[PDB]
Swiss-Prot record, chain A:
Pfam families: RNA_pol_A_bac, RNA_pol_L. Gene3D superfamilies: DNA-directed RNA polymerase, insert domain, RNA polymerase, RBP11-like subunit. This is DNA-directed RNA polymerase II subunit RPB3. Core component of RNA polymerase II (Pol II), a DNA-dependent RNA polymerase which synthesizes mRNA precursors and many functional non-coding RNAs using the four ribonucleoside triphosphates as substrates. It is found in: Nucleus. One of its GO terms (molecular function) is DNA-directed RNA polymerase activity. The keyword tRNA processing does not apply. Coiled coil: none annotated.
From Swiss-Prot, chain B:
The C-terminal domain (CTD) serves as a platform for assembly of factors that regulate transcription initiation, elongation, termination and mRNA processing. The trigger loop allows entry of NTPs into the active site, switching between an open and closed state with each NTP addition cycle. Catalytic core component of RNA polymerase II (Pol II), a DNA-dependent RNA polymerase which synthesizes mRNA precursors and many functional non-coding RNAs using the four ribonucleoside triphosphates as substrates. Pol II-mediated transcription cycle proceeds through transcription initiation, transcription elongation and transcription termination stages. It is linked to Neurodevelopmental disorder with hypotonia and variable intellectual and behavioral abnormalities: An autosomal dominant neurodevelopmental disorder characterized by profound infantile-onset hypotonia, developmental delay with poor speech, delayed walking, and impaired intellectual development. Additional variable features include feeding difficulties, dysmorphic features, and visual defects. This is DNA-directed RNA polymerase II subunit RPB1. It is found in: Nucleus; Cytoplasm; Chromosome. The chain holds residues 911 to 1011 of 1970 of the full protein. Belongs to the RNA polymerase beta' chain family.
Swiss-Prot record, chain C:
Pfam families: RNA_pol_N. Component of the RNA polymerase I (Pol I), RNA polymerase II (Pol II) and RNA polymerase III (Pol III) complexes consisting of at least 13, 12 and 17 subunits, respectively. Pol I complex consists of a ten-subunit catalytic core composed of POLR1A/RPA1, POLR1B/RPA2, POLR1C/RPAC1, POLR1D/RPAC2, POLR1H/RPA12, POLR2E/RPABC1, POLR2F/RPABC2, POLR2H/RPABC3, POLR2K/RPABC4 and POLR2L/RPABC5; a mobile stalk subunit POLR1F/RPA43 protruding from the core and additional subunits homologous to general transcription factors POLR1E/RPA49 and POLR1G/RPA34. It comes from Homo sapiens (Human). This is DNA-directed RNA polymerases I, II, and III subunit RPABC5. PANTHER family: DNA-DIRECTED RNA POLYMERASES I, II, AND III SUBUNIT RPABC5, DNA-DIRECTED RNA POLYMERASES I, II, AND III SUBUNIT RPABC5 FAMILY MEMBER. Zn(2+) binds at C7, C10, C44, C45. The gene is POLR2L.
UniProtKB/Swiss-Prot annotation, chain F:
Keywords: Acetylation, DNA-directed RNA polymerase, Nucleus, Transcription. The modification N-acetylmethionine is found at M1. Core component of RNA polymerase II (Pol II), a DNA-dependent RNA polymerase which synthesizes mRNA precursors and many functional non-coding RNAs using the four ribonucleoside triphosphates as substrates. The keyword Transcription applies. This is DNA-directed RNA polymerase II subunit RPB11-a. One of its GO terms (biological process) is transcription by RNA polymerase II. Component of the RNA polymerase II (Pol II) core complex consisting of 12 subunits: a ten-subunit catalytic core composed of POLR2A/RPB1, POLR2B/RPB2, POLR2C/RPB3, POLR2I/RPB9, POLR2J/RPB11, POLR2E/RPABC1, POLR2F/RPABC2, POLR2H/RPABC3, POLR2K/RPABC4 and POLR2L/RPABC5 and a mobile stalk composed of two subunits POLR2D/RPB4 and POLR2G/RPB7, protruding from the core and functioning primarily in transcription initiation. Part of Pol II(G) complex, in which Pol II core associates with an additional subunit POLR2M; unlike conventional Pol II, Pol II(G) functions as a transcriptional repressor. PROSITE patterns: RNA_POL_L_13KD (PS01154). PANTHER family: DNA-DIRECTED RNA POLYMERASE I,II,III, DNA-DIRECTED RNA POLYMERASE II SUBUNIT RPB11. Ubiquitously expressed. High expression was found in heart and skeletal muscle. It is found in: Nucleus. The keyword Membrane does not apply.
């Protein structure tokens, strides 16, 4: 339609972790809905079935199962071709809808052993390993760098289990969050008066509020509308930041186009003559 | 309070003070100013009001006007005025005897 | 009982930063600087680690991990 | 466990009939807590709403007429005052002056100080809130609250 | 153009009486150039920054389209009829709820005061030759402020 | 265990339609859409695209209850244009802005940034 503006983007900054950008000339409802997709709708792989062969550790089993689900997983190369479990024709699991992990550790040593993310092995090809320590010429590598201490073991304890990771999205459980956090900010100088400051001098100025380097603090304009939203998406590490954004928009496109097909389905099946 | 004040606010005068009497407020009632019977019946009404005022002073010696009663007649008059679109500056259209009976 | 994978409030993974922290405190008495080097910016992620108590260490010491 | 006791309950002890208690002919139940604070804050006549939010509030209302009211400010841009949207919520056309006794003004001699409307005192007419701010004395378990008159 | 009930250019005596105030509303105290009328009016100071010392032109009408009823109003953005008092800078819609004047003795009906309510924002006007246009019923009044003169 | 299975928050049931349209009994050219298993994310944005259109007289949505996944969208248009077509255009236009946003973001990434992969 003629009244659609088609927005604008600017990437301010990009790292292996963060992606920080500005969206301009669009609606808040778009900005807010797109921020919500970054959390909930972007799909990923995380452990979903844990089968415990032997567990002599001082942590109870369901605790091991909890810590273990929550650990992060690379998915970028494979999260797309993977299908959803319920949709897949197979009974239980298969190579085509899930990937398998195996963990086997025993404390035969006199010193306390730690159980870590590297000790967890993918029966699936090393296309989808755990996040830490793989093709890592990584300056983030410090001391142990176990990514997670699944448990500690004293001389005699042992741990054997199987796990099946599956594709799903954050609306269903928090283990599937593809974000470390999501900053969102709009109209930093409070031109539009969406908040009303009592004694405005008592508030600090963000890094976006510099435009009024002065201390005049918030010049008013009532003919304005919300424009130019600032973002900073931050990667949990399990999916690189730009891929989070591109997959979010596509998923949102997929969800919208589908609602259009059902709305079409109303005009095709049960001919739209009710109203 | 004040017997004189009660008399002033409640009594329907007939001597008609030169204030467009009979044609101010009321409409055709200027035509029933010559009625003897209507004068005696309202004068009878005012006679009941002095006697009621006397009994009511015996019932509530303390002098409180707050009593529990049904309907709330005053709010109803307001509901009545508001709906029929009654303009209080426009002249009346009501016969006093219709009211008393 | 051992530091949780991912901070409650937001999600930033945090168990990985525990072993690193005991090393920094041994080196320096700068809890401010220690938390900073680990990258724990915002304080929700910071309370997580700053307020943890590693009970596991006393717990492991019983001889019978066998029952 | 039968239609017979279900009939008896529906007619005698059903909640909506239990509003005004025969103990002291007043509301047993009124608008309480946050909503009560939120009503005061909403009815202050410095509150203005733009087309987008008014429609959403209209949307949450049940027995809405279906017609959208004309905003109390036409230009430069349409705005509805808070009293105006509260006034769709009042059923039919009940009436009551006062029924505020809010801290406001100058008890005993301020209203006589010519009625510079002072906005404090609440007046509703023909089912529309004309002026004032709603509080526990207007909305609460009061003898003359909006809620009592509505019943 | 709408039929005109009242029309005059007013000058502002004060913008903050007693001082109790609020914010995003201001109470004007005014005086008419015909000096036979007085006025009090609340205005949205946030979007229409008025100031003391300058004469503002105000008009009041009960209609917009030609000279007839229209209070059915879903204000309806789609109307394009140039009947509108649209060249005016500030417009408010409301009803008149109360009117007052000496009404007891001989003649009485001396001058007149009218009370109006624009959605909770109040107005008070005093007059005499404006008696044909005042009510304590009938909604549909529009308050137009324009030009702010020179 | 009186808690519902988490998938039910978003998974469509085989005995329920994705969208339903019912006519208003009060005023003409109004319509009521029921969207099942879809929260504020879809609803808030479709409300805004409808408000963006200049021929929409009224647009709004309400999610009747937190615990029940369902939203309703009511729309009212001028006595000339049908509310269904406005809804069709509202998504299609929204599809167009988001596609252009995805295009513009991707090309923006195509800037000589060296950590794109
Ligand atoms: Zn399968
Ligand atoms: Zn955190």
């Amino acid at each position: 339609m003629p009244y659609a503006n088609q927005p604008t983007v600017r990437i301010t900054e990009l790292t292996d972790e963060n992606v920080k950008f500005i969206i301009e000339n669009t609606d808040l409802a778009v900005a807010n809905s797109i921020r919500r997709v970054f959390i909930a709708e972007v799909p990923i792989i995380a452990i979903d079935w844990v089968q415990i062969d032997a567990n002599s550790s001082v942590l109870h089993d369901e605790f091991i199962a909890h810590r273990l689900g929550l650990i992060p997983l690379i998915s970028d190369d494979i999260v797309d071709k993977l299908q959803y479990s319920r949709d897949c024709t197979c009974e239980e699991f298969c190579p085509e809808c899930s990937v398998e992990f195996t963990l086997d550790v025993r404390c035969n040593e006199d010193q306390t052993r730690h159980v870590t993310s590297r000790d967890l092995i993918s029966n699936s090809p090393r296309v989808i390993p755990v996040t830490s320590r793989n093709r890592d010429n990584d300056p983030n590598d410090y001391v142990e760098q176990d990514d997670i201490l699944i448990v500690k073991l004293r001389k005699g304890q042992e741990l054997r289990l199987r796990a099946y990771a599956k594709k799903g999205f954050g609306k269903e459980h928090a283990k599937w969050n593809p974000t470390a956090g999501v900053a969102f900010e709009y109209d930093p100088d409070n031109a539009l008066r969406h908040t009303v400051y009592p004694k405005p001098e008592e508030w600090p100025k963000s890094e976006y509020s510099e435009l009024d380097e002065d201390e005049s603090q918030a010049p008013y304009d009532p003919n304005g509308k919300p424009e130019r939203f600032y973002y900073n998406v931050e990667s949990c590490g399990s999916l690189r930041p730009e891929t989070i954004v591109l997959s979010a928009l596509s998923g949102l496109k997929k969800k919208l186009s589908d609602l259009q097909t059902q709305l079409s389905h109303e005009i095709q099946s049960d001919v739209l003559t009710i109203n | 309070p004040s017997n004189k004040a009660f008399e002033k606010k409640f009594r329907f005068d007939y001597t008609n003070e030169r204030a467009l009497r009979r044609t101010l407020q009321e409409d055709l009632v200027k035509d029933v100013l010559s009625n003897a019977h209507i004068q005696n019946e309202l004068e009878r009404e005012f006679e009941r009001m002095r006697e009621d005022r006397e009994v009511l002073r015996v019932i509530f010696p303390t002098g409180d006007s707050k009593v529990v009663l049904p309907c709330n007649l005053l709010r109803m008059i307001w509901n009545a005025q508001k709906i029929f679109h009654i303009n209080p500056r426009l002249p009346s259209d009501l016969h006093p005897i219709k009211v008393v009976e | 009982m051992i530091i949780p994978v991912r901070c409650f409030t937001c999600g930033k993974i945090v168990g990985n930063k525990w072993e690193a922290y005991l090393g920094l405190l041994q080196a320096e008495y700068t809890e401010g600087d220690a938390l900073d080097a680990l990258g724990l910016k915002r304080y929700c992620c910071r309370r997580m680690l700053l307020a943890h108590v590693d009970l596991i260490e006393k717990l492991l010491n019983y001889a019978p991990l066998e029952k | 466990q039968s239609l017979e006791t279900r009939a008896e309950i529906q007619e005698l002890a059903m909640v909506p009939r239990m509003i005004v208690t025969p103990q002291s002919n007043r509301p047993v139940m009124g608008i309480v807590q946050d909503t009560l604070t939120a009503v005061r804050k909403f009815t202050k006549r410095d509150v203005f709403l733009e087309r987008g939010e008014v429609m959403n509030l209209l949307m949450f209302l049940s027995t809405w007429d279906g017609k959208v009211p004309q905003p109390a400010i036409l230009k430069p841009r349409p705005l509805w005052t808070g009293k105006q949207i509260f006034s769709l919520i009042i059923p039919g056309h009940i009436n009551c002056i006062r029924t505020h006794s809010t801290h406001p003004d100058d008890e005993d001699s301020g209203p006589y100080k010519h009625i510079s409307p002072g906005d404090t005192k609440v007046v509703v007419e023909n089912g529309e809130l004309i002026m004032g701010i709603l509080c526990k004395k207007s909305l609460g378990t009061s003898a003359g609250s909006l809620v009592h008159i509505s019943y | 153009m709408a039929g005109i009930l009242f029309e005059d250019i007013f000058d502002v005596k004060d913008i903050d009486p007693e001082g109790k105030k609020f914010d995003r509303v201001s109470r004007l105290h005014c005086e008419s150039e015909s000096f036979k009328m007085d006025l009090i009016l609340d205005v949205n100071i946030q979007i229409y920054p008025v100031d003391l010392g300058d004469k503002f032109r105000l008009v009041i009408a009960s209609t917009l389209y030609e000279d007839g009823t229209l209070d059915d109003g879903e204000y309806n953005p789609t109307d394009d009829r140039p009947s509108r008092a649209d060249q005016f800078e500030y417009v408010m819609y409301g009803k008149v709820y109360r009117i007052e004047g000496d009404e007891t003795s001989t003649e009485a009906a001396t001058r007149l005061s009218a009370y109006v309510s624009y959605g909770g924002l109040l107005m008070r006007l005093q007059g005499d030759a404006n008696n044909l246009h005042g009510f304590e019923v009938d909604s549909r009044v529009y308050l137009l402020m324009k030009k702010l003169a020179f | 265990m009186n808690a519902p299975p988490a998938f039910e928050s978003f998974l469509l049931f085989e005995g329920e339609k994705k969208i339903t349209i019912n006519k208003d009994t009060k005023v003409p050219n109004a319509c009521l859409f029921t969207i099942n298993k879809e929260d504020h994310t879809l609803g808030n944005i479709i409300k805004s695209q409808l408000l963006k259109d200049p021929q929409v007289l009224f647009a709004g949505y309400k999610v009747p209850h937190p615990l029940e996944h369902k939203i309703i969208i009511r729309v009212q248009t001028t006595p000339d244009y049908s509310p269904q077509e406005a809804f069709t255009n509202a998504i299609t236009d929204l599809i167009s802005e988001l596609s252009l946003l995805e295009e513009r973001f991707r090309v923006a990434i195509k800037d000589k940034q060296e950590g794109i992969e």
